[PDB]
Design a protein around this ligand. Structure first.
Ligand SMILES: Nc1n[nH]c2nnc(-c3c(-c4ccccc4)nn4ccccc34)cc12
Length: 350
C-alpha cells in the first residue's frame, strides 16, 4: 500500500529503505534529493544517475565511486549505500547514498559572510582531507565551493571526484592552450600554459582560490573563457619573474607571456583590506605562479595561520596508495558499465 515516488524531473526507485523524498538539485550529472533512511534513522542525500548512455558520464561515475568507497576520512564524504538492478542488463540508473549535509560552500557564500574563525576552520578541514587524498597519490582536480559539503555544525567534507585521477608527474607537460575540463575559475595558470594537471600542485592552486573566495564572498579570478582565466590570474599576480623559469620549456607559452606588458603585483592586503595577515601569507604561498615553488599540503597545514588546529598525528594519511588501471580515454562504455557493476556489488544482499 504505497508507491515508487517521483520528485520533479523523474522517478526515484529506492524503496523501501529510504523514503520521504525532497528535491535538492540537479545539474546534468544526476538529480540530488533528500530521503529518510529507515533502519539507521537519519536523513540522507541520494543522487540518481543514468550514465550508461554516455562515455564521459561513465568515467565520472567510476572515479567517484571507486575513490569514495576506498577512502575513509572525516573530511571526505563517504558512500553509505548504492542502489541498482541485480544485473548489468537491468541496470539503467544508479543511486548513491551519503549522509545528509545541509549545505555546501557555494550555497553558503551566496548569503552568509564567513568570519575569520570559520574561514580558518574550513581551510583547515579542506587541507586535512586534501592531505589524505594526496597521500593516496590521488588528485581531485576540481576542488571548488560547490564540492565542499557542510553540516550545520560546520563539519566540512569534500565530495566530487568525477575528474579525479592518480598523480603521475612524468606526464604533466602539454602544448600551449591545451583544452581542459575542470572548472575554469579554479584552474592554475600552468593549465593554460604547459600542463595537463597531473601533479598535486594543481589542487593547491584551487584551494587558494577557495581561500580568497571565502575571504570576500566572490571568485578571485572569474574568467569568461579559456585565455581570460589566465588574464585574470596575471592581473593580480603581476608578471612572472624571469630569474626563475622553472618548467615552461615550450616556446609558445614562454613567448606569449614574454609578449605581455610589464604588470605589477596587486598586493593581497589591498584586495582584502580587513583580513588576518597570516591568512594572507598562506594565500600567497598557495597562489604562487610557479607550480614547483607553490606550497604543498602538509607544509600548508603547518603554516602559522592554522596553528590552532595543526596536529600531524591527528591528520591521517591513506593506508595504501590508489591504483587506477583504467586509463584516461581508452575504455568503452560497455566495460565501464561492468566495472561500475562490480564496484557496487558489495551493497547487494550477500
Ligand atoms: N552529502 C550531501 N548532502 N547534501 C548534498 N548536496 N550535493 C552533493 C553532491 C553529490 C552527491 C549527492 C548524493 C549522493 C552522491 C553524490 N555529488 N556532487 C557532485 C558535485 C557537487 C556536489 C555533489 C552532496 C550532498
Amino acid at each position: 500500500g504505497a508507491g515508487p515516488e517521483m520528485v520533479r524531473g523523474q522517478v526515484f526507485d529506492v524503496g523501501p529503505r529510504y523514503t520521504n523524498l525532497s528535491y535538492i538539485g540537479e545539474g546534468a550529472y544526476g538529480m540530488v534529493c533528500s530521503a529518510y533512511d529507515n533502519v539507521n534513522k537519519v536523513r540522507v542525500a541520494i543522487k540518481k544517475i543514468s550514465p550508461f548512455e554516455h562515455q564521459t558520464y561513465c568515467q565520472r561515475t567510476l572515479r567517484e565511486i571507486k575513490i569514495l568507497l576506498r577512502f575513509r576520512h572525516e573530511n571526505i564524504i563517504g558512500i553509505n549505500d548504492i542502489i541498482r538492478a541485480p544485473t548489468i542488463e537491468q541496470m539503467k540508473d544508479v543511486y548513491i547514498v551519503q549522509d545528509l549535509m545541509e549545505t555546501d560552500l557555494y550555497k553558503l557564500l551566496k548569503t552568509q559572510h564567513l568570519s575569520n574563525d570559520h574561514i580558518c576552520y574550513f581551510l583547515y578541514q579542506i587541507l586535512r582531507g586534501l592531505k589524505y587524498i594526496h597521500s593516496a597519490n590521488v588528485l581531485h582536480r576540481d576542488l571548488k565551493p560547490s564540492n565542499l559539503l557542510l553540516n550545520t555544525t560546520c563539519d566540512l567534507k569534500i565530495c566530487d571526484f568525477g575528474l579525479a585521477r592518480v598523480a603521475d608527474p612524468d606526464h604533466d607537460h602539454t602544448g600551449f592552450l591545451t583544452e581542459y575540463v575542470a572548472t575554469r575559475w579554479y584552474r592554475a595558470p600552468e593549465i593554460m600554459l604547459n600542463s595537463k594537471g597531473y601533479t598535486k600542485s594543481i589542487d593547491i592552486w584551487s584551494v587558494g582560490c577557495i581561500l580568497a573566495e571565502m575571504l570576500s564572498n566572490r571568485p578571485i579570478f572569474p574568467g569568461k573563457h579559456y585565455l581570460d582565466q589566465l588574464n585574470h590570474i596575471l592581473g593580480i599576480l603581476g608578471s612572472p619573474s624571469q630569474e626563475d623559469l622553472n618548467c615552461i620549456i615550450n616556446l609558445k607559452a614562454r613567448n606569449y607571456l614574454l609578449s605581455l606588458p610589464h604588470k605589477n603585483k596587486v598586493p593581497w592586503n589591498r584586495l582584502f583590506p580587513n583580513a588576518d595577515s597570516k591568512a594572507l601569507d598562506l594565500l600567497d604561498k598557495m597562489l604562487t605562479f610557479n607550480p614547483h615553488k607553490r606550497i604543498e599540503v602538509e607544509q600548508a597545514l603547518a603554516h602559522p595561520y592554522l596553528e590552532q588546529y595543526y596536529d600531524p598525528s591527528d591528520e591521517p594519511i591513506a593506508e595504501a596508495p590508489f591504483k587506477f588501471d583504467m586509463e584516461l580515454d581508452d575504455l568503452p562504455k560497455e566495460k565501464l558499465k561492468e566495472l561500475i557493476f562490480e564496484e557496487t556489488a558489495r551493497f547487494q544482499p550477500g
